[PDB]
Design a protein around this ligand. Sequence first.
Ligand SMILES: Nc1ncnc2c1ncn2[C@@H]1O[C@H](COP(=O)(O)OP(=O)(O)O)[C@@H](O)[C@H]1O
Lengths: 141, 152, 50, 286, 52, 194, 94, 279, 67, 155
Amino acid sequence: LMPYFLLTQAVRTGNLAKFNQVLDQFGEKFQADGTYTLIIRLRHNVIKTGVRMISLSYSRISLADIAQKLQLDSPEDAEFIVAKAIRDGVIEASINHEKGYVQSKEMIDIYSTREPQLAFHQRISFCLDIHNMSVKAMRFP
Amino acid sequence: LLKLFTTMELMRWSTLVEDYGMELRKGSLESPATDVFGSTEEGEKRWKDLKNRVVEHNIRIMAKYYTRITMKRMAQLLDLSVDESEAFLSNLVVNKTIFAKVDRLAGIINFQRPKDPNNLLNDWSQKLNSLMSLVNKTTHLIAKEEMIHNLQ
Amino acid sequence: LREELQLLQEQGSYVGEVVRAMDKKKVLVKVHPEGKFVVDVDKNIDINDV
Amino acid sequence: AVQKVVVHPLVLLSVVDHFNRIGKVGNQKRVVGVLLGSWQKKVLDVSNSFAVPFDEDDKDDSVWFLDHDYLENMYGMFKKVNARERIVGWYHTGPKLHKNDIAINELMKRYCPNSVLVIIDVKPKDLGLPTEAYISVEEVHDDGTPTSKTFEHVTSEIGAEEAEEVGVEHLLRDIKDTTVGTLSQRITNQVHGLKGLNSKLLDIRSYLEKVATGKLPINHQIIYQLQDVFNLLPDVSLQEFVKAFYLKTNDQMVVVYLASLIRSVVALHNLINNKIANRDAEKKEG
Amino acid sequence: DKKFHGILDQGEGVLIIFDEPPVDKTYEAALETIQNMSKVVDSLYNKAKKLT
Amino acid sequence: QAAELFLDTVSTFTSYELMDYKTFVTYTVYVSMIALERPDLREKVIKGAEILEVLHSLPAVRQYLFSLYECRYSVFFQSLAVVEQEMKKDWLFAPHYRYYVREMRIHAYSQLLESYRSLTLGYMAEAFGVGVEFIDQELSRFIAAGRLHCKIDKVNEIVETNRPDSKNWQYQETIKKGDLLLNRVQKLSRVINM
Amino acid sequence: TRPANHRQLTFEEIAKSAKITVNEVELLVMKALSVGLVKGSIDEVDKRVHMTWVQPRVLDLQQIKGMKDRLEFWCTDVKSMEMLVEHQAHDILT
Amino acid sequence: EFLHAQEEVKRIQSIPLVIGQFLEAVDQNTAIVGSTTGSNYYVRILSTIDRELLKPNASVALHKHSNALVDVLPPEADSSIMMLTSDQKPDVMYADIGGMDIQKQEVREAVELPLTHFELYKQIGIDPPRGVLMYGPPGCGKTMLAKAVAHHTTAAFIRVVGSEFVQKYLGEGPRMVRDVFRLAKENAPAIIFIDEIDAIATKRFDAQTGADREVQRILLELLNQMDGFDQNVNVKVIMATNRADTLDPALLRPGRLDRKIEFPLPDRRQKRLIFSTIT
Amino acid sequence: QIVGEVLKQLTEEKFIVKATNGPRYVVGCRRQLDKSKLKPGTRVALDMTTLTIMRYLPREVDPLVYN
Amino acid sequence: VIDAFRLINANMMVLGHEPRQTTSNLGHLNKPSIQALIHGLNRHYYSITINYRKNELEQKMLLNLHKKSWMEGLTLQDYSEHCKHNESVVKEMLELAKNYNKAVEEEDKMTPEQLAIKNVGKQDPKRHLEEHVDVLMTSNIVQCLAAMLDTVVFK
Ligand SMILES: Nc1ncnc2c1ncn2[C@@H]1O[C@H](COP(=O)(O)OP(=O)(O)O)[C@@H](O)[C@H]1O
């Protein structure tokens, strides 16, 4: 996990050469585990992950600023990346071809308080399967 | 008195000084009237007292009628400018006579207390029960009138 | 428990300080409101059980 | 003149039994007697009943007879045994009311100034109504309407007599008309509440349809005055739900966290205790 | 020091004063119940009885 | 925990154990500064008469403590750097990158931007030291870290905070704990039936 | 006619209804509140008047079809939702 | 059906209760209670209520006609009034008193136990005092020390009032002593202050006249409660008397109450000090 | 009605009323009356049989000597 | 209590006593009170069996009409007292939290039933059982469903 720790640090930072070097050093175990194709996929999706994190960080971030932050050096590439993030739906960052506007959040609506209970009311389903298991497993003799 | 006591009329003192202001110039005896407003210094002081008095009266009657009223209309109704109208509004609120909240940058006012959801749903349920009682009473009334009308 | 409540409607039991255990299944007892109440013996407890 | 009347669960069955016992030979379908009780705080209550044999003829509804001496002796005995009891009204069966009611009221009001009429449905149990109350008002039908009889229904609600709970519980002891079994009982409550709402509102819709057809006389002068407000009362605006999006949804989600989860956790504790016990028993039996 | 109920919107050069509803302490009380009714029990009990 | 059991000003010796009573007090001040920001801390530590006396004994210590209490960032940041330098010269330097100055300024920035909605970066920079770019990068780094509940409008250079209501934030806390305890009960469902 | 179906009594709607000017709207709605026609809130940013009536009158019994239709709409909605919750509740009620 | 039956049998009425004090839970499904009119009888204890509020000698609730254990009333001070929580209230703080000391050093000694120091009572090996009788006249107030101290170190303060206690509620006297002792035990910062002992409560030289045996039995139960305290907690008990001569030896003997303090007359120098302080 | 004193109000529903001659009971209050009219330590009237508060009454003391 | 008996002459006791005749019906649920036993009545001849004329046309009338709740199941009552009721519920279940805590650290390794019998506490797992939590949940869901049913009726 120490090289995995450095991989996490590289994912957060957005740099390339350092983690490429450490992969060339100790990537054979990654190949043995069978994730090296995925390893390169992370190596080139580090920019996507950094874009998600910086979009969560900022409200209206400049495309030039995000390109400089994640080593894109290209306004058009930054625009393409934010387009790809929004079409993937991982983040809510939108595009305004004027300067790169992104909408902010809003106060809580009808379902924003109800989605936790809707996604969590399986508690009674767990209770009923527990009770049925008890019914199955209360043999007296 | 009949005009200026009740029914929340627009007490535009500019109109009143001629509609009901004849006591200043000539009435039946006009002697108490000339003592009050016909005087020069104390008379003008009591004139200003009528002016503000009717300003707060208009503010109060507007409180129970209009929730949000635009600043220009409120100032025109109070026969003053925006700053004077807001100053008198502050003078009322510091006395707690009216429940008023104003956005000064937007210059828009509100007189209704924010309804807590507890009592909001409570009055909703009271409305529901009023409707239920109305259903019961209407049902009995129409059924019995139906009986009387098919007694043929 | 409801039947116990109905029994307690008749006070349930009465506290008695036993003094004299006579041979003929008899105990004088003392009850705080009044005092001595000569009475028989129960079936679960013999004369000597007193 | 009374604001409202409240009927006890004390005289209904007595009236029904009186009907049953005096209808053995009198098949007029018309049981007429007096309901005695008390009126104290604009709330009238009935504590005792009495039936008198009574024969009618359809000819102008003026053929009848009673035993007034016996009825008055009954009232004197009832007042002697219980002074607070007084004749609160007179009752007739046969909810299809005839025209002798005015004469009966005129004759009996010497016992009660605000004479009222009570109809008991011995055989009918339509939805839940045991009886209906009637107040006599002949002071002009309306501002711009001709003369009429116009016996109106003073609002009636079934009261709660004391010390009858023991008897009714012992009597039924089979249905348990209480909130027992809370969840299922409230489900049944919702069910028959919806049933009653649908039936009554369907009756109101039928009354509106029949008024539109005009086959029956139209008492619009109170009908629209009472139903227009009902219809226009704004219980359809949903922006108050917008303002109260967490109307209780916070309580809903805390209950999901703290009742369903708590039940699941306690059931899990019971199951794992039982599993430990069963495993230990299976391992240490021999 | 929570002596006032507002937020200073410097961009608009104003301060938005808001009437804070304090009846929402049920939220925090429920969280405290969750914490002191689950943490103190689940970990301890099902780490003591790891084998079942 | 350290603070809760360490404010007790009952020393076994007048000057021993932790090298002094003054060093004891410096430990107390550091621990409290890590501990909280500014609630009735006035009535918890500031009211301490021995506390005020020992801050009289140590002016610079009194200086940064009163700077944090008064929320005057211009002197606060310099004094906080001095505090970090002092902690470097101390073997109790375990929070070398977490809780020397970053956590304290996380608390300070929370305190500042709360009761604010949109405070400009350029003016908050001079109200909080100098180097508008330095404050901008610090805010970006700390928002990435997770605290400082706000966002940055870079095209206009504004700090638009997002403070949840009492209901909203506590709701968020409850859903987080619901996630943790669903994980717990799923682990316990694994424990059962095996 | 509109049971809060159109609860936005804007100035233009008021002008269509009463062929009255803008300044007279204030006095007209004041007298309406005084008599008992409309008792709702009166705004001026949007000039919206909330709709509550507590002084009913003749509803043109030849036009009782509208209220009959609204009442039967309420009946259909209530019965449909009762049947829907019965469908959801067969697992207990059946 | 069985869930319906279970939720149906859970009615237990319990609206029209009456009060008759519990003696003690001998076992489960058996008990002994004493009603308000006496009539101590053995009863059956239902499983609805148990040890959670079934403290030994606290006043409880009973059914109107069944006298059965239904509920236990938590509060104890207002059962017979006799003062209550004079705590959380500065009436006269401490140094504001005009009597300066008289001694007041034995009284700071008496507050040492409320002023924690129960841990320092051990280790050092000292045995802190328990009973403080002040056999002084109304000079010094004799209650400016108990209205104070109770606020100097936050602690509950009770007037008790001996004259009121001797009354028809002599059978309930033991019970009220138990209740007030329980109120004190509930709050380790508490001090009992009893007044007007000398003339009415257990005079030892004039023979028993009628209800004097009731007073002696009440004092016996007070001794029983103070012995059952046995330094279990840090609450304190102080009587205030004008003359301790008529007092019973049982309270007067060491091992129950030790510290005798006399609060003398204004002491002309101290009197001038009092005048300055009040004025 | 029997005469007693409000020994303890307990709560809004149940109250402690002590008869002048011994027993105190946990009773209800009269519907028309309110707690502000009942108050603690005030003379009241309990129902003879059902044992519930029926009316509250003022009291008086008299020295009746050399008046 | 409605107990009916008969007074007897002196001859019934000198003949074969217990005038209760030869059948196995009046021995069903025949529990005379102690005072009745010590008195002659309810002991002279027998105790009479009671029965209630629960005839239909009468009993159906009573059950249908007297105990009447027919459109009263439509009450909404979302938060009339229920916000503070939920506050109190949270406080009660926090007490339950402390109780179930106490139980889980009691949890002794000596057949915990042995510990529990002598250290009953009437806690959430023992006496404040899941039934009370179910009552709270039923109240909440009943108010929820009434509110939501009327919300969908509101069209
Ligand atoms: N500063 C003070 N110093 C001494 N006594 C005071 C002071 N202030 C008030 N007092 C008096 O002390 C009195 C207490 O008297 P009291 O309690 O009746 O005496 P005893 O306790 O002997 O019965 C009060 O009546 C009050 O007037």
